[PDB]
Enzyme design. Structure first.
Site, PDB file in Angstrom:
ATOM      1  N   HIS F  88       0.902  -1.139   0.000  1.00 21.34           N
ATOM      2  CA  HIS F  88       0.000   0.000   0.000  1.00 21.34           C
ATOM      3  C   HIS F  88       0.943   1.190   0.000  1.00 21.34           C
ATOM      4  CE1 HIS F  88      -3.963  -1.715   0.726  1.00 21.34           C
ATOM      5  NE2 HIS F  88      -3.461  -2.500   1.660  1.00 21.34           N
ATOM      6  N   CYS F 130      -0.203   2.748  -4.034  1.00 23.27           N
ATOM      7  CA  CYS F 130      -0.949   3.973  -4.280  1.00 23.27           C
ATOM      8  C   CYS F 130      -0.062   5.169  -3.944  1.00 23.27           C
ATOM      9  CB  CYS F 130      -2.229   4.014  -3.445  1.00 23.27           C
ATOM     10  SG  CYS F 130      -3.449   2.740  -3.905  1.00 23.27           S
TER      11      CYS F 130
END
Lengths: 4, 140, 5, 92, 92, 140, 4
Positions: F88, F130
């Site tokens: 992430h 991300c």
């Protein structure tokens, strides 16, 4: 030299 | 199928923002030598086929308007678009004669959903400006 | 065009 | 559908967080390099090949000159950010 | 001397400030595209040619699908940051 | 010459960091599909000739230490170095299982002055993560 | 699909  | 189609009437528009003198309030000094850069850039991009225009000592508002208006022109017959920024700057921002403005806001005008005539066409930005105060001492 | 090693 | 951020290319004179050098009598290092390469290969090399040679030229041919030892002999490396989806040649 | 920040290349799955997509069943869009291009051209194309093709594949071949209309039919474009000073080929 | 010299005993090291599970306190969910990415990346980079090592569910400290030690190894006989991060992320940072760490700090270890055996050699970082929460609706 |  100079900085930008 | 791996190269951009350059079979267009014009190569494209090229904007050169040459900021040499800044308002005393900004505290930024004269960028001596930027005129030689601008002129040398003018010739090179003209030689490539770009229709270039040079704008000197632009305020933040002027730079914004400049790019916004360009993004609103019809690029149907152009192969691409190019913009060269010459000024003082910091991370993510560039100086106008009166202060700093986000680089992101200057370029966003050209997103696919905001400039249909440049959709699927290359949008080039060349930026000569500082991005912080770190120094690279080099090695070996 | 032509890219080449 | 095409991503709205696709087909952009940013050719920065320096990497994030760093200064960018300019010689008052010759112009900024980045522009000097860019123009010399474009003048010689602007119409026969792909854009990344051109900018890659510009990175090399800036990185190898320049070194800061100042009285202040704090800004003496510093180096610089440009930074190319590409969201392009095809190869770019300024010709044909 | 060589700049300390020279010779790095960052191949990001997406652009600054944006999300990056992943399929629980097939993996992330970026990785699927990268492996696909590398398996077919990893040994005959220059690194930037490879990544530019990855950019195009991710931009054209993928679109998000979610039961939520807010995250439905969304797109993605990778981001290549290069400080390389030479062309890179994985063969020879 | 215009190409990196690839005449070395070996192509180089390829480090893959596959973060699938994260501590509850981070608010990050399981990254289903990441094992498939890691497997495909591993096979792919091995085929290219890299000596690949796969790490799994690493803490921020493990990621930092792991990359610091790699940068202190002798790469004299390698042509390049590759590192693939799967996790992430938010702008400029990547998640460890216990938190966030700056991407700049992870890659800084390989700077020319901190990893001399990789000087003048390409240092590649592939990052699947991300970088914010903006969505691209697309056009056309 | 999910976001990373």
């Amino acid at each position: 030299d100079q900085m930008x | 199928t791996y190269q951009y189609n350059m079979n267009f009437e014009k190569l494209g528009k090229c904007i050169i923002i040459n900021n040499k003198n800044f308002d005393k309030v900004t505290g930024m000094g004269v960028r001596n030598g930027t005129d030689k850069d601008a002129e040398a850039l003018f010739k090179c991009f003209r030689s490539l086929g770009f229709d270039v225009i040079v704008y000197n000592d632009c305020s933040c508002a002027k730079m914004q308007d400049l790019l916004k208006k360009a993004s609103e022109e019809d690029h149907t017959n152009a192969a691409c678009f190019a913009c060269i920024l010459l000024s003082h700057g910091e991370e993510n921002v560039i100086y106008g004669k009166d202060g700093v403005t986000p680089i992101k806001d200057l370029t966003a005008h050209f997103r696919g959903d905001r400039c249909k005539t440049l959709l699927e066409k290359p949008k080039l930005f060349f930026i000569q400006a500082c991005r912080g105060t770190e120094l690279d001492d080099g090695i070996q | 065009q032509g890219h080449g090693e | 559908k095409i991503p709205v951020e696709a087909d952009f290319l940013f050719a920065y004179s320096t990497v994030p967080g760093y200064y960018s050098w300019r010689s008052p009598g010759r112009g900024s290092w980045f522009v000097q390099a860019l123009c010399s390469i474009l003048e010689e290969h602007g119409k026969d090399l792909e854009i990344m090949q051109i900018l890659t040679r510009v990175n090399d030229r800036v990185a190898r041919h320049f070194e800061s000159q100042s009285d202040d030892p704090h800004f003496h002999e510093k180096k610089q490396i440009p930074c190319v950010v590409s969201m392009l989806t095809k190869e770019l040649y300024f010709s044909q």
